[PDB]
Amino acid sequence: IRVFAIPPSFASIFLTKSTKLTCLVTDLTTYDSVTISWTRQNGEAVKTHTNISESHPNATFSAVGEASICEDDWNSGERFTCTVTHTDLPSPLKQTISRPKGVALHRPDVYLLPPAREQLNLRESATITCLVTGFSPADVFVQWMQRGQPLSPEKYVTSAPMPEPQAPGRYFAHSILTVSEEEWNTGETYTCVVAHEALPNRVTERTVDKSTGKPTLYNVSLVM
Amino acid sequence: IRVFAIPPSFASIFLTKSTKLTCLVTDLTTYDSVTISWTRQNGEAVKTHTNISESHPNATFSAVGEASICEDDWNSGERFTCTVTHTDLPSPLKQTISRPKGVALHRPDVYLLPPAREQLNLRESATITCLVTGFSPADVFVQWMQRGQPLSPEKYVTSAPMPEPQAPGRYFAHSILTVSEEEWNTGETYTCVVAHEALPNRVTERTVDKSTGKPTLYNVSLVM
Amino acid sequence: IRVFAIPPSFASIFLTKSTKLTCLVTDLTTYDSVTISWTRQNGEAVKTHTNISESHPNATFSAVGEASICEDDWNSGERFTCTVTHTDLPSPLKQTISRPKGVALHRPDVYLLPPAREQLNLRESATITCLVTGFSPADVFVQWMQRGQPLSPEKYVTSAPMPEPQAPGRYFAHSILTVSEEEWNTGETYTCVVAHEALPNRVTERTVDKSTGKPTLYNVSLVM
Amino acid sequence: IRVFAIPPSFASIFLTKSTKLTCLVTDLTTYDSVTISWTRQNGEAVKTHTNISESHPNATFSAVGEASICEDDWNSGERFTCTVTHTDLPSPLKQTISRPKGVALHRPDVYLLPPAREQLNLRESATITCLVTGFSPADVFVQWMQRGQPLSPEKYVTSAPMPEPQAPGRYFAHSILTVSEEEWNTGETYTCVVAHEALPNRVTERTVDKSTGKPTLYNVSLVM
Amino acid sequence: LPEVKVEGELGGSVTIKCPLPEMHVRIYLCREMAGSGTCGTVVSTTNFIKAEYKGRVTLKQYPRKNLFLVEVTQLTESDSGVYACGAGMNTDRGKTQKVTLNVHS
Amino acid sequence: LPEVKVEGELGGSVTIKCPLPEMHVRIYLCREMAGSGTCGTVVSTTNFIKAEYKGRVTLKQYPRKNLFLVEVTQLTESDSGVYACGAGMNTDRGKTQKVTLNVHS
């Protein structure tokens, strides 16, 4: 008997604006006519749990329970309880998931770096790098927007938050968007919007273009 | 004999992260033994109000009722009515409150302007303008950030959305921040942030500093 | 049972070169056989009104009375009262109208601002700002002149005097003129003129063109 | 018997804001207890004629009659009449003065010129010249304001409007302000405000400084 | 890059065919003034029809074949030049397709 | 041109004597920062008292002897430099009289 409860993640909440939680039931046989429901701390009821996951062909059972709620209830400290009943396990099953209170909050620092000159010389492809460092806890959502329209999510790769080597409790993450050099050389502007639950508006945007960082060459000083 | 309510505004929602339903009574002589409750289209009641107000000194009475609910229902358009019972009226008055469902949406365009040269000659102060144009509906929120920390709202002024003459339906607004000529001539980048429903993350930031329109490629200095 | 009057404003005086005394009736059911006359502190009557108004469709009646007199007496503070006679009221109502005699006077400061660079990239339009600050009382008149000929008032917008946070008593106002990026890039000097009582001739003009902040001593051109 | 009536001049009206007209009685003996009064077209009365001119020691009599009126009455076409009674001439005397209707109106053109280089080389004094040309009729009021405060009227000299040599009906005038060279070389700004009853706001201002008109010397063109 | 080299007749109307891209909201049919290296927007999705073309042009977008069509009603000698169409806030840095126009009369 | 070379003591108050000119409405007691060639207005008739000097200085004008007097209450090491006083909108192009200040403690 193994039933998994997945608390909502900030990345998913910001991505879908439709906060959801899942009670995944596994380690059981493929039996139909199951009963799954989500209940609050005081034992109330929730909406219907539609879109039940299909059974797996490897002699495993999958079921999901979705409870539509609003973020203030989840983040106010209220605790949820999942109800699972089955013929194999007639005893009711209860699981508790909530926010892990008791952690300090810090704001990330975003640094956007241009492609390497040697990479540009190949006159083939270019990679812009976004470095998010110093944020705690580990729940950062990174997205790339070219001209106000987000690029296909399959164009960039983001890294899981690995602990900062010198700073205990704080973390860092990476994000690489590979663009064609021709586009980058035409002045196309790219920005790295990052969402964290410690930022003032929980949103922050840093941009980069071919002219960003280039130094001054001529220092004309005409004297009379 | 009227009861006027105050529906939650987008500015209040984005400022407090809490949508609230509130209604006040007017044109009624001051009395007591009055209970105010909030109801919804579904029919069930909601949380109880608190913080009873006082009696207006112009021979009128007003009662305030607070009810905190999910903003999704307010956006969805749920019908919310507050019921007030008085002595002179035999039947309690009903006040239905709902958001207008269906408005052309257009993202606002922001433009920051640096202080005039003739103003930076008295060596006393400077005024920076954040100019928002092209946005429907007329629910916009503007605030100023310095060095990643918001400033006090008692040092800038924001106007009300005035309709655009050229494009009918579109509106425009203006925000002015009064700083010191010293501070402005000592770097100090200033950022105006605008929140609107048509915006992708409902957030938009722009910055201007003393050196913003420079070529940054050459540097001409006339010395005598 | 009220009769509200409209004293001449400084904006109207400077716009028409004719001070006029006007009063309207309100909260009275529509009727007829009503005569309106204007009287002064000295006691003698003045010219007869013309252009009888109509009946408001909200069960209210309004009568308008015009009287043209020298602005010097209005400034001097002569007491002007219009007398209206109705049937329901047995005694005609008296409405005294006088200018507040004694206000701190401060000349307004004007600042014209050129359109933002990011706006002159869509090659569609441009907005020029005339900014008036530091003036008491709140009677100011702004209009735009192009090539010595005034423009139509249906292509610029002026705000109402909003109190200055820093200096109490002082006010500020803003006027925006929407022109074309073409016209602005083809010279075309634009002038905003401000009329206030504290001004020496009650007139103040300033102009800005495409080339205003240039050194006009050297001319650097980067060509590749 | 010679009695002179002086219609108000636009220069005096703009200078004093207290429009006045004078009925000067001359060619009589120094006799006291005279009676002089001003009357309108319909025979009404005016205010008291205070400040009677003193008799002259050269066996001539001087008397002035002042009637305080407002400009719209004078400029609306209404005609005035002066009443003079004396022992030597018991017969009443009447004089009619008004605006000379039937003349075209044109706006002046103002050109402000800097001092001559040779005059500056003397390193002593400098003279700024204001040239007002092409205005009809001949009633122009010229004034000089350094920093918003008018300079002493005894510092500059203005010329009477002489007919334009090539343009019939139009006139031109001059005005010379002599300033110390030291002041002019320190960037002191001077302006020439001219008032005419054909200008849009009846006011126009042209300014001049040491840097006004100086041409560009350096044309730097750096190429890569 | 591509040139329709569209042709027409004096009077009547002519349709300009230009590609409708995605991830670009502002769509314009700029006119290449080619005077001081500046292009003036004739029409846009932001709603701006030049005064000289007011009441004579329209822009309809429909992502069926990834195409947006712009129609010019009436015709004048002035209507015989280049009308580069493109997207993005910067008008001079778009001009995805170039086209030419003339008059046959 | 003239220098009062006014002197004072720590604490208490010191009065700065500067000429009150005519045909000039704005009267200021600018402080010569002498950093990047810029002078910051300490006080003015337009009503602007620097934050560091807020509630400690005042400006009274009376054309009796063509003089306006400015009093500085309290005193700090910071209050030991040049305070050129002048008139006109441009603060750096006035500075009619120059003065120096110090502290004796």
Ligand SMILES: *[C@@H]1O[C@H](CO)[C@@H](O[C@@H]2O[C@H](CO)[C@@H](O)[C@H](O)[C@H]2NC(C)=O)[C@H](O)[C@H]1NC(C)=O
């Ligand atoms: C200084 O040089 C610049 C660059 O040559 C001049 O800018 C040109 O001005 C003309 C009109 O006078 C325009 O037709 C050109 O388009 C401008 N060049 C660019 C690159 O836009 C400028 O006019 C010169 N200054 C003066 C006073 O003549």
Ligand SMILES: *[C@@H]1O[C@H](CO)[C@@H](O[C@@H]2O[C@H](CO)[C@@H](O)[C@H](O)[C@H]2NC(C)=O)[C@H](O)[C@H]1NC(C)=O
């Ligand atoms: C280009 O040259 C100018 C003139 O030398 C530099 O302006 C100076 O900047 C420093 C601070 O960096 C100030 O202390 C000076 O007051 C400035 N000079 C003037 C006359 O105000 C400018 O900084 C140079 N540009 C860069 C990028 O260094």
Ligand SMILES: *[C@@H]1O[C@H](CO)[C@@H](O)[C@H](O)[C@H]1NC(C)=O
């Ligand atoms: C640039 O020129 C200015 C003025 O001549 C000079 O002060 C400065 O040192 C120069 N920059 C460098 C890096 O030498």
Ligand SMILES: *[C@@H]1O[C@H](CO)[C@@H](O)[C@H](O)[C@H]1NC(C)=O
């Ligand atoms: C100034 O320089 C520009 C750019 O090199 C050039 O086009 C122009 O002709 C020059 N001016 C004169 C008067 O030669």
